[PDB]
Amino acid sequence: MNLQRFPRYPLTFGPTPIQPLARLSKHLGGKVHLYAKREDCNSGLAFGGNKTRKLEYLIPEALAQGCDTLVSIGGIQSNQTRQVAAVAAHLGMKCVLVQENWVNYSDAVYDRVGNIQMSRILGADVRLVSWEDALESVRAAGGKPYAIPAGCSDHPLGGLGFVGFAEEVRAQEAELGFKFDYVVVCSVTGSTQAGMVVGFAADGRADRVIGVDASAKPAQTREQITRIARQTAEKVGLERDIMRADVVLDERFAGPEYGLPNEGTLEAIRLCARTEGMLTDPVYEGKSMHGMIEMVRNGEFPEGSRVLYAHLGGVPALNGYSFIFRDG
Amino acid sequence: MNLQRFPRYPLTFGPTPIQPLARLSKHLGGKVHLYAKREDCNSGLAFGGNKTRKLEYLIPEALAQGCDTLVSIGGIQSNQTRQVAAVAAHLGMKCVLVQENWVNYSDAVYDRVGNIQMSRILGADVRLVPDRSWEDALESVRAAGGKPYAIPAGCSDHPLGGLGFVGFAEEVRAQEAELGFKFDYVVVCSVTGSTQAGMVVGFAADGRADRVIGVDASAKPAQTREQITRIARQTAEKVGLERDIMRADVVLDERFAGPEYGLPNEGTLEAIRLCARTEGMLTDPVYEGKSMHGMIEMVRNGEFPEGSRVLYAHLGGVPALNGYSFIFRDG
Amino acid sequence: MNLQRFPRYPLTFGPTPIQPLARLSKHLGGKVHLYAKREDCNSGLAFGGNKTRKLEYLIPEALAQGCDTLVSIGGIQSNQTRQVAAVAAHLGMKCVLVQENWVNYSDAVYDRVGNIQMSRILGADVRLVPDGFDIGFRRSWEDALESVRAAGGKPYAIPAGCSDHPLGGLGFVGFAEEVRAQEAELGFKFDYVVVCSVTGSTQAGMVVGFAADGRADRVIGVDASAKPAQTREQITRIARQTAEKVGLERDIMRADVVLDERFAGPEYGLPNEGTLEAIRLCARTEGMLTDPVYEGKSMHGMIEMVRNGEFPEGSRVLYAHLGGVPALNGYSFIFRDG
Amino acid sequence: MNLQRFPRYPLTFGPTPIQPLARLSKHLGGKVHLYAKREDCNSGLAFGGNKTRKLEYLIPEALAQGCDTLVSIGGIQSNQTRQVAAVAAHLGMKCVLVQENWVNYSDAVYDRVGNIQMSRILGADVRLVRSWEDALESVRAAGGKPYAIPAGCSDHPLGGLGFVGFAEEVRAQEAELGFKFDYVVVCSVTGSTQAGMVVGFAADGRADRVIGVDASAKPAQTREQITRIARQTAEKVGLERDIMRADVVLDERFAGPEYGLPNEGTLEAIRLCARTEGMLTDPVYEGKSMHGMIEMVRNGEFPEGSRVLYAHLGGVPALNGYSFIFRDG
Ligand SMILES: *C(NC1(P(=O)([O-])O)CC1)c1c(COP(=O)(O)O)cnc(C)c1O
Ligand SMILES: *C(NC1(P(=O)([O-])O)CC1)c1c(COP(=O)(O)O)cnc(C)c1O
Ligand SMILES: *C(NC1(P(=O)([O-])O)CC1)c1c(COP(=O)(O)O)cnc(C)c1O
Ligand SMILES: *[C@H](NC1(P(=O)([O-])O)CC1)c1c(COP(=O)(O)O)cnc(C)c1O
């Protein structure tokens, strides 16, 4: 394949670091070596995260097209909209965000802390409810909007970012002098796992990318990942077809609903935070973290396996679930 | 000087990057070139920040002495206490925090969001004083069978507490080498003092100690200024600075600290928004929003020589934003 | 029947008023005439409510046994614990409250507004337990009572809602009494009565009281517990124990206890879209507010009933407003735009 | 005087009850007999309060003029705006409220709990910010006819009637009680509450016995408003006398530090009063008038044997906006 064909606008510090989770690894039995690739610490633009790696491939088209306003959408505690708001300010562009009530949750400060709060400070026009109305709104005002779908996923360039991710991992394995056996990643809108599948199919490891569902609608998410992997594979000239076998999506850790954690989620967030000083959230990472932990605990990983946990970000959202953590 | 003499436990990713703030620079008139050194993005341990750089030099002593528990203190939204609980967890050490009511502020979720929230998740035993707690906590650890390492507010009034930022100066010189030029000034928020202290010492090494413009956030200028000078001198002796820190070496602007510690004025808010909206770089209403305020105001007043290159140190503190949600409800 | 046998300590202002809900009635078709008996406005003791009516009969005992501390229990936004705390300060007694989280709910200011906020200002010792503690499993109840004694005081035990307590059903039999006296003036009788039911003695007392004139099965209870079976049984149990206590010249039949299960979802403490619509409609047509936990659900019940035609044309339904409005503060996000 | 001249639309349950605060009284020395008139429990309309008594005399005009919308104003945690939203709903009228930030305070749920939350549930159109004129005009431009209700109903012709009536009630109740109250403590900010009391008690020569406790932190301005509204009101009811400045007593000692912000004494008073009587007061108004009355008794400023009547004007729901301050009681 050839990813180099597509321009990348630098929004990050550079390749994200990989750290050993020795204490957690040891706590679970010392039979599986866990690591963490810090996608959550990739930028100075409002904490960044996985959506920021993605945006590096969309920005060029935005500029090439001469757009002056970035428009995106997501739930109230959306990490994506927050990142787009930061990226926007950094580039000198206006920003319109559609924030929808995607979660059956009602916290008193849910629409005033964490991610949404930062977006308002960052100067974005935050519209709480729509998509087309926002876009049209921009034209009618005399500006040219660049449409960024949820999580940047269902977009032509939306999976390029994480194809690069697999690239980076190969380069880093070279340095470490060893290859990771699996990769755990959280999936919801899909292009994160999609890009990984494509990139890792390149070396025969697409099926080693273990996606954990956090949408609680595994069928849709699975299909979207598959569809985007297929479009992205073509885009980058993957010398192969993405098969259903190439898309692994665990469905055991998404409950009870999207945006709502279960007792295991909370326990996972605590264990990880208490053994490594590494925080995860109640919506996404706490769920992928829970999945990985549970997998090791079940013996689902071959002894001696090196698993690379991809921490995609999302911590600011912790502020929207304050009461659940009042005593830790 | 010789800083390499003291061991440093890795808690950060490595040197913190310097980024130009061209939009904000241009916004103000294009006469002063503004930059930022991101100490706020120095670690994967619960967002880190300036206190984390400092802790790199206290930990080795904590481990050497075989302590099994880190104990510290700060106000409700303290950044220090959170970093201490992250570092603790990472190190396999227990953690006890004394959170006090240092701010005349009363937000509904003040003690349940931001920094303190993370601390509890991190496993620290977070103790809220009513409404001697310090020695009470230290002893509670001993009486429990452990050995506590005492970390004073901000790590500031501690022998090793200023080493962290002498190294900061070290880092900037090496970076100036690559950049091929030297920064004319540096802006740093100051409250308990060893951050500025370390900078004054480290920059005194090349005669730029007076170029470090401290911006007070304690609203108690005199005390803070004094503590900075005292920690600077103690530290200078610790590293073998080939000079003595003069009172003139400690600069501290008292204009942007109001109205009180932990409370922002309208300038602070304006500053926060302006920087946020022009660079996508967030700052808090307690510390950084004030230093940013000071810098912006300095540039706007022509107090900086035209053509000057001013390096703003972003110390962190953004999570505290959650404790002031209403003020930012409409942005 | 003889209720006058038991002493009643004044905690209320006196009989609670009945007001016509003319706009709501007209809005629903004008075919059923809805009224409301304001138990929610029965006292100066921290907003009172149905639980304050019941306490009038328990206090005399607590004082006669010379208890110096009232001890009770309830969820975080329990109305019961708040009224106990007020009544207690008013009488010069100490107060210990065991509060656990009985609701799968997690609002940022849940344990610091509304009812619990008042109990703390009222001087009660509010004992909360972190999630997973299980007061029911550990027995925070008995630990509280013992702690009071160990401290040198004498506690008077008041169970959840006063319901499963010998004197607990007395209060609302008096309610039926009041309603007949008031019906005399009105020159007519209410065909039904809608009341919200959770721990039981409110409807229970009403059943006893109204059985005395053959209207027991006219008391339509709406379940807000989401555990209709247990609730129904406790009502029936409390009603029988209470009937015997007041000398009801009858046996309470399974048919005398009506409990509608259609408006309790999805869980105790959690409202449905219907609950919210009922709250807003009643509020916007009468200036009368109800909560997401209790009243909003009975109100939903009554409205849904009228709209369904389950009420005979011309019927006059008497809605008992038990109180609980303060709990609204625990559900701010839900009402952020109305 | 003749108050019966003006029509009063029933919005309350009837005369408000008076209760003895025997515990509080004994706690403070037992040398002064404290009582309370529960204006805070006057109506089934969203908790009511003193503003509801005032509204009883404005509604007739509103209806007589055929207005279909009630428009009022006040701070975020305004009691008045809540009471107007409830009254409107009850009357079948639309409601528009101008909520302004009159308090230097910034709690996370300040604009989502207590009074303002109820107003939104009651169906009023709650506008957070010429704001006043803009609302009135938007109503007209919409095809409706708005009835303008100024802050607290105070600077309004009919605004002072409601509490002249309060004095009437007290006289009637003193009759039954077989005795008269020597003083009356009332909280004052916009003014028509104490103003009306001054007029109505002027009738029996007790106007200087109505002790107003300022909660505005701008006593001069508040004192002048009371005096001003009292005079205009006295003329409207035909008081057989003119209201002198000595007729208006306003203590400035307990309004600090600002309007809407309580001091340590406020909090203490709120607790002492709640813990001895089971009667709650808020940190904006009543907690300050309560603070005042307690400090007065504790300082001996009341002659031994006096019977002081505390007017509880309401406002408890505002408590929800100051949650952190009471987290531990
Ligand atoms: C340090 N602020 C602390 P805390 O909020 O407790 O962690 C100590 C009060 C701090 C400073 C000031 O640094 P000093 O070395 O002068 O104490 C500036 N900026 C941020 C983000 C801080 O956390
Ligand atoms: C009583 N609800 C209580 P609490 O939440 O502790 O105050 C007991 C659970 C209550 C009810 C139901 O009355 P019961 O006699 O059936 O328990 C209905 N409405 C309101 C407002 C209550 O407080
Ligand atoms: C009235 N306070 C108001 P609001 O907060 O808008 O309802 C007007 C500012 C009020 C007062 C003071 O009465 P005045 O007649 O002097 O305005 C005292 N107590 C309570 C509970 C009020 O709501
Ligand atoms: C992305 N989550 C988003 P948002 O909350 O809007 O920013 C998109 C729903 C996200 C994911 C999942 O990534 P996908 O490519 O599968 O959508 C995982 N982890 C974090 C922290 C996210 O923010």
Amino acid, single-letter form, for residue A215:
S
Q: Is A242 helix (H, G, I), strand (E, B) or coil?
A: coil
**Disruptive mutation site among B16, B40, B90 for chain A (greatest number of A CBs within 10 Å):** B90
Solved by what technique?
X-ray
Q: Where in chain A does DSSP place strands (E)?
A: 18-20, 33-38, 69-75, 94-100, 125-128, 145-148, 182-187, 209-213, 248-250, 306-311
Domain C66-164 part of CATH 1.20.1420.30: no
Identify the residue whose tokens are 């010189």. Answer: B173
CB A58 within 8 A of CB A84: no
**Alpha carbons B66 and B63: distance in angstroms, whole number:** 5
Q: Is C260 helix (H, G, I), strand (E, B) or coil?
A: strand
Q: Where in B123-267 does DSSP place strands (E)?
A: 125-128, 148-151, 185-190, 212-216, 251-253
Beta partners for C97? C72, C126
CB D122 within 8 A of CB D160: no
Domain A1-45+155-328 part of CATH 3.90.226.10: no
CA–CA distances in Å: residue D50 to residues A323, D40, D42, D112: 36, 7, 8, 23
Radius of gyration of chain B, Cα coordinates, nearest whole angstrom: 19
In this structure, the number of other CB atoms found within 10 A of the CB of residue A201 comes to 24
Distance (Å) from CA B190 to ligand 1 centroid:
7
Beta pairing class for B18-20 and B33-38: antiparallel
Q: Domain B66-157: give its CATH code.
A: 3.40.50.1100
Cβ-defined contacts of A65-69 (< 8 Å, 24+): A65/A144, A65/A146, A66/A144, A67/A93, A67/A143, A67/A144, A67/A145, A67/A146, A68/A93, A68/A94, A68/A143, A68/A144, A69/A93, A69/A94, A69/A95, A69/A96, A69/A138, A69/A143, A69/A144, A69/A145, A69/A146
Distance (Å) from CA B83 to ligand 1 centroid:
11
Helix axes C295-308, C273-286, angle to 10 degrees: 90
DSSP per-residue codes, C4-38:
TTS-----SSSS--EEE-HHHHHHTTSSSEEEEEE
Helix axes A263-276, B79-91, angle to 10 degrees: 90
Cα-based angle D35, D37, D43 (whole degrees, multiple of 5): 155
Distance (Å) from CA D28 to ligand 3 centroid:
27
Q: What is the resolution of this structure in A?
A: 2.5
Q: Is C186 at the interface with chain B, CB within 8 A?
A: no
Fold of the domain built from segment(s) D66-155: Rossmann fold (3.40.50)
Which residues does A37 contact at the CB level (< 8 Å), separation at least 6? A16, A17, A18, A169, A308, A309, A310, A311
Domain D1-45+156-329 part of CATH 3.40.50.1100: yes
Domain A66-154 part of CATH 3.40.640.10: no
Domain(s) of CATH 3.40.50.1100: residues in chain D: 1-45+156-329, 66-155
Q: Is A108 at the interface with chain D, CB within 8 A?
A: yes
Helix (H) or strand (E) holding C128: strand C125-128
Q: Is C316 helix (H, G, I), strand (E, B) or coil?
A: strand
Helix axes D219-237, D192-202, angle to 10 degrees: 50
The HSE-up count of residue A226 (CA atoms within 13 Å, CB side) is 13
- How many interchain CB pairs under 8 A, A with B? 139
CB C153 within 8 A of CB C71: no
Of A227, A136, A157, residue with least CA distance to A190: A227
The HSE-up count of residue A305 (CA atoms within 13 Å, CB side) is 18
In this structure, the number of other CB atoms found within 10 A of the CB of residue A202 comes to 20
- Subunit contact C44:D41, Cβ cutoff 8 A: yes
What string of H, E and C letters represents the secondary structure of C77-113? CCHHHHHHHHHHHHHCCEEEEEEECCCCCCCCCHHHC
- Tell the burial category of D15 from Cβ atoms under 10 Å away from its Cβ (0-12, 13-18, 19+): middle
Q: Is D125 helix (H, G, I), strand (E, B) or coil?
A: strand
Instruction: Give me the helices (H) in C165-251, please.
Output: 171-186, 201-211, 228-246
Q: Is C333 at the interface with chain A, CB within 8 A?
A: yes
Active site residue A25: no
Q: Is A13 at the interface with chain B, CB within 8 A?
A: yes
Rounded to 5 degrees, φ, ψ at A111 are -105, 20
Query: Closest approach of chain C CAs to the CA of B85, in angstroms?
Result: 21
- Tell the burial category of A143 from Cβ atoms under 10 Å away from its Cβ (0-12, 13-18, 19+): middle
Give the number of residues written for chain D. 329
Query: Closest approach of chain A CAs to the CA of D260, in angstroms?
Result: 22
- Subunit contact D108:B107, Cβ cutoff 8 A: yes
Domain(s) of CATH 3.40.50.1100: residues in chain B: 1-45+158-331, 66-157
Fold of the domain built from segment(s) C1-45+165-338: Rossmann fold (3.40.50)
User: CATH top-level class for B1-45+158-331?
Assistant: alpha beta
- Tokens of residue B121, six digits: 């998740």
Beta pairing class for D94-100 and D69-75: parallel
Q: Is C141 helix (H, G, I), strand (E, B) or coil?
A: helix
CA–CA distances in Å: residue B292 to residues B32, B54, B214, B219, B282: 14, 22, 11, 16, 10
Q: Where in chain D does DSSP place strands (E)?
A: 18-20, 33-38, 69-75, 94-100, 125-128, 146-149, 183-188, 210-214, 249-251, 307-312
**Alpha carbons A186 and A286: distance in angstroms, whole number:** 9
- Subunit contact A108:C334, Cβ cutoff 8 A: no
CB B149 within 8 A of CB A307: no
List the single residue in B with minimal CA-CA distance to A92. Answer: B278
**Alpha carbons C5 and B163: distance in angstroms, whole number:** 82
Domain(s) of CATH 3.40.50.1100: residues in chain A: 1-45+155-328, 66-154
Domain(s) of CATH 3.40.50.1100: residues in chain C: 1-45+165-338, 66-164
- Subunit contact D324:B107, Cβ cutoff 8 A: yes
Which residues does A280 contact at the CB level (< 8 Å), separation at least 6? A268, A269, A272, A273, A286, A288, A289, A311, A314, A315
Report the nearest-CA residue for atom 6 of ligand 1: B78
Query: Closest approach of chain C CAs to the CA of D203, in angstroms?
Result: 30
